[PDB]
């Protein structure tokens, strides 16, 4: 048998409870520190160690930041990725009526979120799976971006098109775009922000056409005036496109009330990816710099 200095056996951690359905909550046997162990799946894996896990591992090892999930180590026996355990996630907390955020706190959440995005994009990474359920909040009220198994490094580019859970997937992708960038994550950031008041994913399509229809009933309609050059997508002429139609602020006018929150959301859920605000400018928006000011979590 064979020496192995830099890959510890997962037995150092003691399995407490299944979660993912193989993801386990566990307890370090010496210190009691709670962690999450995610087994790397090996069904249908005909080409040795999964390139998708290599990629994710590659990215997690790169991204080290207060608002990005932290990979502690990789363990053998299968193979497991070890993460700091995190009890809550934005999706859980928002679908839980007993949980209640003040405006002051919502500001803090979006602030941490946008800072996480600013950072990962700065490192030439696209998250590609923006959704409430992929946003963690630690016991100490620290927001972390999680789940990079669908993330990809970035840099005419031809990236993969079927990316991002359907409800959060941006117009660009729903039109067959393959040369996209960090803006796809910001669109998803938009969908999450609005979700902070509406307590439910604002746009719940069932098919790609249903999602695109819903987007039009919110952002006005895909128009070369609104979105310069949009008509060069072959899936634009083909698939059905509505006419007439901007309602971003009216439909959200109810839940939010605060002028600034509504203004930022209008700038996140912008149709043209190139006119969609970025993480740097969003953090700078008056929403984070007018009263009440952002406050800590409990």
């Amino acid at each position: 048998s064979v020496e192995c200095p830099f890959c510890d056996e997962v037995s150092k951690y003691e399995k407490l409870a299944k979660i993912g359905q193989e993801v386990f909550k566990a307890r370090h046997r010496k210190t009691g520190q709670k962690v999450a162990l995610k087994k790397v799946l090996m069904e249908n894996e005909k080409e040795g160690f999964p390139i998708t896990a290599l990629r994710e591992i590659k990215i997690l090892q790169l991204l080290k930041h207060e608002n990005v999930v932290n990979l502690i180590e990789i363990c053998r026996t299968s193979i497991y990725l070890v993460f700091d355990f995190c009890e809550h996630d934005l999706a859980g907390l928002l679908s839980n009526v007993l949980v209640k955020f003040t405006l002051s706190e919502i500001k803090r959440v979006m602030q941490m979120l946008l800072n996480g995005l600013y950072y990962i994009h700065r490192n030439k990474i696209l998250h590609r799976d923006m959704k409430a359920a992929n946003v963690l909040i630690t016991r100490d009220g620290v927001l972390k971006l999680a789940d990079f198994g669908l993330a990809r490094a970035f840099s005419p580019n031809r990236y993969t098109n079927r990316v991002v859970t359907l409800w959060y997937r941006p117009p660009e992708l729903l039109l067959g775009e393959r040369d996209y960038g960090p803006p796809i994550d910001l669109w998803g950031a938009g969908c999450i922000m609005a979700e902070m008041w509406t307590r439910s994913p604002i746009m719940q399509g069932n098919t790609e056409q249903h999602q695109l229809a819903l987007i039009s009933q919110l952002c006005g309609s895909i128009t070369p005036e609104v979105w310069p050059n949009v008509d060069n997508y072959e899936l634009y002429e083909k698939l059905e496109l509505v006419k007439g139609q901007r309602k971003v602020k009216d439909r959200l006018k109810a839940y939010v009330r605060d002028p600034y929150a509504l203004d930022l959301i209008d700038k996140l859920l912008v149709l043209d990816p190139a006119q969609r605000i970025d993480s740097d400018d969003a953090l700078n928006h008056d929403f984070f710099w007018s009263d009440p000011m952002p406050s800590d979590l409990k």
């Binding site: 020496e3 830099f6 890959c7 040795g48 160690f49 591992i57 590659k58 193979i79």
Partner: protein, 252 residues
């Protein structure tokens, strides 16, 4: 951490292979042969020099933990390459890599029937070996190569296309022929390569008005004492290597 895959000369002496009765010199051969097999397969598989390089670093590192006496170069090279190709986003199919490995190692045999129990078995062997490499490297797969830094350096110091061409050649050969990648950071190695390339071409990059030598803009730690020491080692091994220098020799 940072200091983890960089070793002292004494650490290189007491290598896992040494513990099992391999001469310093024999072990050095086993490494150079692995780099050659990696280069041959990589060319046939039509992966980049970068992927090939990455696989060479994996192999170099893998044998600071393991012994040649327990894992043969001819078994580790293909797996390392299979892995490095995935990591560098130029995945080659498992069966494909096994097939090219076979022709390199056994030009005269003929591939077994991909239905045989003995062939299904060699596929299983590679997969098992890839997993052992990953665990030996502790899943640290992001490799930095000097080539990145040569371009930076030879460019910002105004070198002919030629001088730049010779520097990359040296960088690539420093991987096949030496363990510098186990001792010196990539920015330092790049300096070593540019330095010899200059010497080989009778070129000298002029001292700046400030009194700074070109390399001080490349790595603050680097000293000429060290530069001359390393270029001499690299030049000596290049001379022992048949035809290698012919490739950069000005024949005019």
């Amino acid at each position: 951490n940072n200091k983890r895959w960089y070793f002292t000369r004494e650490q290189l002496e007491n290598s896992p292979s040494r513990r099992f009765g391999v001469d310093p010199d024999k072990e050095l051969s086993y490494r150079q042969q692995a780099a050659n097999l990696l280069q041959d397969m990589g060319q046939r598989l039509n992966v980049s020099q970068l992927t090939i390089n990455t696989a060479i670093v994996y192999m170099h590192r893998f044998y600071m933990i393991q012994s040649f006496t327990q894992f043969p170069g001819n078994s580790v090279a293909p797996a390392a390459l299979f892995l490095a190709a995935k990591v560098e986003e130029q995945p080659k199919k498992l069966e494909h890599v096994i097939k090219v490995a076979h022709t390199c190692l056994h030009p005269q045999e003929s591939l077994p029937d991909t239905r045989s129990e003995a062939y299904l078995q060699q596929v299983q062997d590679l997969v098992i070996l890839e997993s052992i490499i990953l665990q030996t490297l502790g899943f640290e797969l992001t490799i930095d190569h000097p080539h990145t830094h040569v371009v930076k350096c030879t460019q910002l110091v105004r070198a002919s296309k030629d001088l730049a061409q010779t520097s990359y050649f040296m960088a690539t050969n420093s991987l096949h022929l030496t363990t510098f990648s186990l001792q010196y950071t990539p920015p330092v190695v790049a300096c070593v390569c540019i330095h010899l390339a200059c010497k080989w071409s009778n070129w000298e990059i002029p001292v700046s008005t400030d009194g700074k030598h070109w390399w001080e803009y490349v790595d603050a730690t680097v000293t000429l004492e060290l530069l001359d020491e390393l270029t001499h080692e690299l030049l000596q091994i290049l001379e022992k290597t048949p035809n290698r220098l012919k490739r950069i020799w000005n024949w005019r």
